[PDB]
């Protein structure tokens, strides 16, 4: 079991670790059929998304992605700095897969 | 995949990108009847609904449904400024489809 | 569809709207058996509840009881102005269909 | 319809009204195997659980249980003062029915 | 039943309460595939998972698991002092089984 964020990343193909020490700068979410997403925005410009569940996820994964989604609503609200993402290069914008907060 | 609420908005038929960039005047809830829905109202006059789901809604639009009124409930209370909406024109009030926050 | 409390609320027999414009004074939820309920009060005595579901109720307006539970307590903890709520006034406390909180 | 939580303690055997008018001192929660419990205790030595479900336990009762245990947290959180608890006296610590807060 | 931390954690072998008296450093989240999990650390370096579920984890078990994680991002996210931790010691990290926080 990893024991933080850059372990973890790196236990998985086509994903990097972001550093951004920063607060969220926008956060979008949409209901729209197809496109059950949600998107945050960092003020150097770097845009990720949280990825619509899949075609009948476990209870695990989807739990999961309903969490993350929890989680960077009410950072952005509460302007909680993040301090490393953990993202899947081969979607766009890139896919969360994990979040480090500290400071 | 749209990388920002108005792309995201413009790939549906019947849409309205809407500005804001102000907080929620006033956030009302039902849970009367085949009312159970949500209204929020904006100091300009816009008034918006998040449509009930009715009897063959899949999960996925159920939860996206429900998270986006928990949305607009943390919104209102912290003041959060709304940037922008995507509503669906055919109904009215306009129903949310989709929301941006920032600043 | 009604774009405000008002309206939602003169659709349904026996309700009436209250203008509190005002915090909540008292919260009280129950977890006791048949007597799953909220009730709260206003400093100027009116007393409110959020009826039991009964056994026949549907899954849409259970969520719908669960959310305003949710609304009043969070309301109450921090404070937050009830503009009007609509109550059904064949019950004892009036029991809360819908609810509107502006500044 | 009780309109209070010392009328609604009264519906029911085997219960008493704890009068504390303070903020929860400390918050305890497992979710250890058999002991998916939550304990609050107040400054004055008071302690009191949110009891691990029965097996035939009903969905509603259930919902009721969570909840209590969501508000506990958030009240121990915001330092809410606790007015009322109706408990149920045939358990060790008391077990927690209803609460009431008011300042 | 236990009354605290200390003794309902003296009921499983491979326990041991830490006594932190201290706020979380660093919170870390990940929805990625067999890692659905969360950790805790703390300025003194102790290091805390929340442990990913089993795949045939029972209702209340689940549950708990999920008001955790919960749990621990709001301690999180409001500088809440965290007492004791029951965790655990069969497991890297160490695995959360109950926390307690008091002031
Ligand atoms: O678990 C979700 C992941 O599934 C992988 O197969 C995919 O490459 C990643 O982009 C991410 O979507
Ligand atoms: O949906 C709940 C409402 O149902 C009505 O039929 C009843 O008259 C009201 O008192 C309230 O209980
Ligand atoms: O509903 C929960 C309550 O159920 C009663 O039967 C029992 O006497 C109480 O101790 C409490 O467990
Ligand atoms: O119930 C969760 C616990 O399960 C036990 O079997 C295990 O030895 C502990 O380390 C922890 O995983």
């Not at 700095?81 to 953990?86: A, F, I, T």
Request: charged share 20%.
């Amino acid at each position: 079991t990893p024991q933080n964020i850059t372990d973890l990343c790196a236990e998985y193909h086509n994903t990097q670790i972001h550093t951004l020490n920063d607060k969220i700068f926008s956060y979008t979410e949409s209901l729209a059929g197809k496109r059950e997403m949600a998107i945050i925005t960092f003020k150097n410009g770097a845009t990720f998304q949280v990825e619509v569940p899949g075609s009948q996820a476990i209870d695990s994964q989807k739990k999961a992605i309903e969490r993350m989604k929890d989680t960077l609503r009410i950072a952005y609200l509460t302007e909680a700095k993040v301090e490393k993402l953990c993202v899947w290069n081969n979607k766009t914008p890139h896919a969360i897969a994990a979040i480090s907060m500290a400071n």
